[PDB]
Design a protein around this nucleic acid. Structure first.
Lengths: 276, 276, 276, 276, 276, 276, 276
DNA sequence: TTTT
């Protein structure tokens, strides 16, 4: 090893690369401009920063996970400032239930029940929370129903896969089980491309009846029974008004820290009871 | 950080990048030539200046807004030099009404009523004021009716969207509500492109009857009732002559400063009364 | 600002860039070879030179005008050496009339009457004077009737637009009014291109009857009446022989200086009287 | 030779290149981050690192083999920590039999019987062990049934060829004998490409009846008799549950070391007896 | 100006650029190899020499003419060594007539009679003299009858134009008058290209009857009468044998010097008399 | 000449370039890694090494031959270690016959009889020896029957041409005589390519009846009689078992040295007698 | 001029460029490797050597000829070592006849009789001597009958044009006279290319009856009579055996030196007598 | 001094 000087400063940037998780450039711009000031004061190129960016991305994709980037660092422990807790307490969820549920879902604790399905009206606000969690995660995957043979356009070996609204065709439904039960299987991509899907945590953002899988023009129900043993049904009948979103990263980080500080056992149950 | 010397001068340019808002090069040329003289005396290239330009553009697109670039810095407070005030006083608008109206429209204060619609004859001069405001804004969006499936050709994640003359087809009309009510929705761009439209302030520059939405060959009226609760009708029957335009940036900056110095509450009303 | 040494020499070149107005390279070659000698003695490349050229072009297109490059610097004041004055005195034009006419036409003094139309036989020599004035102007525009939907091929945001022989089709005739009356309007270019035409001084070089606008196969006359209030008719019945041209820049510069030294008021009149 | 100082370090990297066997970049990123730190601290480029990588790959492909990268370096000799030994003891395999079997299969000791075929249910877990062994080997080959005339898409002069599920067509079946008996033959690749297949150890990962070669639509049996004299039948009727995989490299390295420490003669027999 | 050292040597090359007139590279190679030796001893590249070459070419095309490169520098004044004088004395031409004729033709003295037409048999040798004069001229053009709408393939804004054998079509015949009489005429080229041809010296090398203009399939004679007032008929009935050519540059230079040393007036006459 | 220092080390590499004959890179990798270590310690590039490689290749193709790279350097002289001698003594070949035969065939001593044809069963092992000799030769040519008009795909001006199994068509048969008798002729390559074939030593590796030339669908025999006067028939009826190959370079080098140490005259005879 | 140090060594290379005449690289490789050793020891590049090569090629093509590169430098004067003299003495040619014949043919002494035609059987060996002379000449031209409108594919302004076997079409016959009589004419190349053919020495290598010009399908004889006055018929009825060729450069150089040392007059005669 |  040589160990120069300016390159050592890059090591400090590595800390930032493990501070909030930055993959592209929008999050790096939204973070702070002091990093850009230091980069402009140092060298005005594009080789070393691009190399560091791709190295950090490969490291986060081959070693780092998602919950490791969700553990809070500031011991706040304030349930009053947590605005998303009001939604859980209004929908009828126990404060020491869904917390450990998504803790085990993110850390791959249950193994088989690695899916959380949300049910309710579209006027609630679950889409905003899902988008906020996807933005806070450096490697997020959004299933955009655009192609007939490639629904996972953005899900390119990410950490959390988000299933948008829409029914899937009977061609890889059983393969979706490997993505809905925390298993590893080999799927077919575009043309001359075959990548293995790692057991990644997947949350269904479809507010409609996801159990009614419509096979193009016919609604099927033969896959509803097994899916009840691999996912988690989180239904709610509470409607939200305006000014009840704009969730960032500090709130969810403090919530994750508070949930990790109090470990609560979770039993195997699909239909979540309306208690607490 | 290294903190050299020459690169520190770039920080001074950052001030200019937040002085009047410069994105392309025409505004930078029209500003002053001393910056170009200093750049030619320093280093004769195109890498560092292009990097600074794209960085400032990304910063202004991901963090900065529009009213933040409209607050005046010189405390003039002179209503006689404000030539556009005569138009408002002749059309029948109160001096302490429309000012706070567009103040709340730009700063996203009302939230829902984030649209200002202008009505009247085409021989007035609202198009000149709209073009001047678009030129003063570094990220302006003009809806040019050129494509059948892409009307927002210039509206590429800008700050203010300007709706030109022409009726929209019944394919994304309800989606236009998300752009006319200050909401966030996912629209379809060209081919294999899907970008989310942020709640940006939109002003309709169509002097004709915008409520009569013509669906290609038939005029519809089912969307006129809800649009009255999300926009602002600003009608006028006063005709202007010649030599009553060429509005620049100092006049609108002083007007914005004077409007911010006197905060006046605005009630929810679509049809603006002819008083003041 | 660093302020080196060799780059400071570029500032001296800026003086040349505002000495006679050079946009391309033919005028720079026809000027003097000492500039090329100094450039070859300095640096032998094509980066600093091309950057300076495009910067000067953008500056002259976005700030500088045409009459600012026509004011003479040497106080000659000699009416005997002015050979083009004989043509004006033979056609029946007052020496203190057409001078102030084109002075106000170039400096945009009248505002509305910003067009000078020349009438007479084709054997006079107005085309040579027009070509000389276009060559002396750094940003000249020649309307070459080549395309059916793009007559202004060379008029790419220049200073003076020259209308050659030929009638226009009834598709943008009224738009031509904005170019014949000193107004600003948005026209359609080729494919996916829309540029606004600035109020630029336009002189019609068509020696034939320009009032008889032929709409392809039919001669129209509904636009002749308004055009009499926006242009200037300069007819002449004097025929010129040989050796009465080769007008350069010093002669027209001295003529402009002499016309500016004696300001004479000009009344609104289309048909120029044959007096003086 | 020059022998500088910065180039000497690369020699140390050569040790890593012969430590665990790294060909691409995923394995290098999964190893340690200290090598990347040292690389970033030294020189930030991509011309020397790529050179060393391709040189090491060519060296390992033209000289090094597979068992040479499987010999353990730490004398552990612990049969309790070896979790894959439980599978062999449950299937009915002697601890001092299959060990020497795959030792001779990897080191090319038998010469003719250079193939190990596994038989049993698909719910056992042989695919996980095969994938682990392929990942530990720097040059692994997976036969992916994708093309009709190119089944060995990944087998590009590697060390171990893995035969996946699926029957082969009667076009190169006898040629497969040269790959199933440890011989050298010339095969046809894609278009205008002919490469000789070296006698490489091949293990069939097809859990189904591999002896029933289906020729598209008809099952053949004329090649089953000779294949019994070139391969090794390893059948098992024991089913495994969950949490019995995740085989790394240290486990298989210790197993190879323990098998090499005790050399046991192996007789020529296709059907492996269920003893031990 | 900087005025270095090696670049100053380029100034010496400028002398060569005005010594014999070099545009391409064949003449530069045929001149002397000392320049190439000095260039190889200096810097070995192709960025500065090409720039100097194109700059000198543009300068010679926009400022320099043809007779300025034909004036001899060595006062020889020897009529015996001039071998081309024997042809003129045998054809019946006065030694002090055709000399001043082509002197006024090259220096543009007559203005209108700027064309010299040669008539006689094809076995004389005028083509060799024409090729020699074209080779001695740096910027020369030739009309090669290859395209139907582009006869002047080589005449790309040169000094001396040559007209080979071939009758012109009735398309620009009158335009050819401007080329056969010396007049600035704006014509078109291939596709969307215009050019203003200047009064350039043109020589019709057609040894056949050029007055009989064949319009494709019909011979016309309406242009023969005016062409007698713009060209010069030089007929001859003397046939030459072998070894009476290979004219270079020194001979024609000495002839031009001797003709310039004795100025003789030339009267306006088309048919040259057979005297002297 | 400058004669630096590091470049002088390249001269040492030249020795390696004439040590074992290296053209591509596989032989250089299979040789020794000390050369690569020295190259990595010197300069990490590919401009100078590629230049040296192509220069050595051109030198070996335009000057060096094949037997010059087959003369051994170590005086071993051991007939017991020569394993290929057992094959010759079992087939019925004299130890002092075929040695001088291929010595004269390689060194072009006979001139006309420059071809050695091998006959016998395909289970002997002549293909392995042919491949070994082709690998030891830096410029080897293998005739791969792939194209209908280009059988010599690899024979691109090499040293030894190897004729594989397959009959030739009646389109270049007689031309093959120039390749089977040691003559020079001009053949036709692909498209717009004509290269002369130098008299190179050619050995036929076809174990089948090469005299029965099949012209597509008919067997011809009119070329068998002359081919008996230009080639050498080496038939054998001895079958070989396993473990009787893997011939390298030291064995054939020692055999060539021993054959050169004892020069034995060879008479002109096609059918080799079974004696010795 | 600068005249450094290492560049001065390039001047020495110029001597080599005029030593044996090298245009491409095959002759430079076949010459000596000391030049390449010195080039590799000096500077490792390809921008200065390529420039020198193309400059020397252009110089030799525009100034140097062919016989100037054929004069020997070593005064050997040995008629016994000249092996090609035996062919001339066996065919019936005087030793002091054909020598001066080709001396005048190469040095362009006769002027009109600048063609030497060889007649006789194809089994003699004139093709080998022609190829040797073409290889010794740096700029040789071989007429390859490949295209229907471009037979002179290799004859690109070379020194000696070699006419291969085949008859020419009646499309450029008379033009061939300019190439067979030592004249200058303008021919048509491919597409949009017209180059003048310089009077170059041409030797017909067609051993068949060249006088019987076959016009595609009919044999013509109207051009045989004039061709007898511009070429030289060299017929022979002596057949040669083997080992009577491999002519290099020293032999022909010594022959040219001996022929130049004894100048013998040659009379005008087509049919060469069989004497001497 | 700091490029290829």
């Amino acid at each position: 090893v040589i160990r120069s000087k300016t390159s050592a400063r890059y090591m400090e940037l590595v800390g930032w690369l493990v501070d909030k998780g930055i993959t592209s450039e929008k999050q790096w711009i939204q973070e702070d401009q002091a990093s850009y000031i230091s980069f402009n004061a140092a060298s005005n190129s594009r080789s070393q920063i691009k190399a560091a960016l791709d190295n950090a991305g490969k490291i986060m994709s081959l070693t780092k996970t998602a919950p490791d980037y969700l553990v809070g660092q500031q011991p706040v422990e304030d349930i009053s400032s947590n605005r998303i807790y009001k939604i859980l307490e209004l929908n009828g969820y126990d404060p020491q239930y869904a917390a450990s549920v998504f803790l085990g879902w993110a850390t791959k604790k249950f193994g088989k029940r690695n899916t959380i399905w949300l049910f309710g009206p579209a006027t609630t606000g679950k889409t905003n929370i899902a988008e906020a969690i996807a933005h806070t995660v450096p490697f997020y995957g959004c299933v955009n129903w655009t192609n007939e043979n490639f629904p996972f356009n953005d899900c390119v070996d990410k950490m959390v896969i988000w299933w948008e609204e829409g029914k899937m065709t009977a061609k890889v439904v059983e393969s979706a089980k490997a993505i809905l039960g925390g298993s590893k299987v080999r799927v077919d991509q575009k043309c001359k491309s075959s990548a293995q899907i790692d057991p990644t945590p997947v949350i269904v953002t479809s507010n409609t009846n996801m159990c009614a899988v419509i096979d193009g023009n016919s609604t099927t129900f033969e896959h509803q029974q097994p899916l009840q043993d691999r996912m988690f049904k989180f239904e709610l009948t509470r409607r939200l008004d305006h000014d009840f979103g704009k969730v960032t990263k500090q709130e969810v980080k403090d919530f994750f820290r508070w949930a990790k500080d109090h470990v609560v056992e979770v039993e195997h149950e699909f239909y979540v009871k309306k208690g607490g």
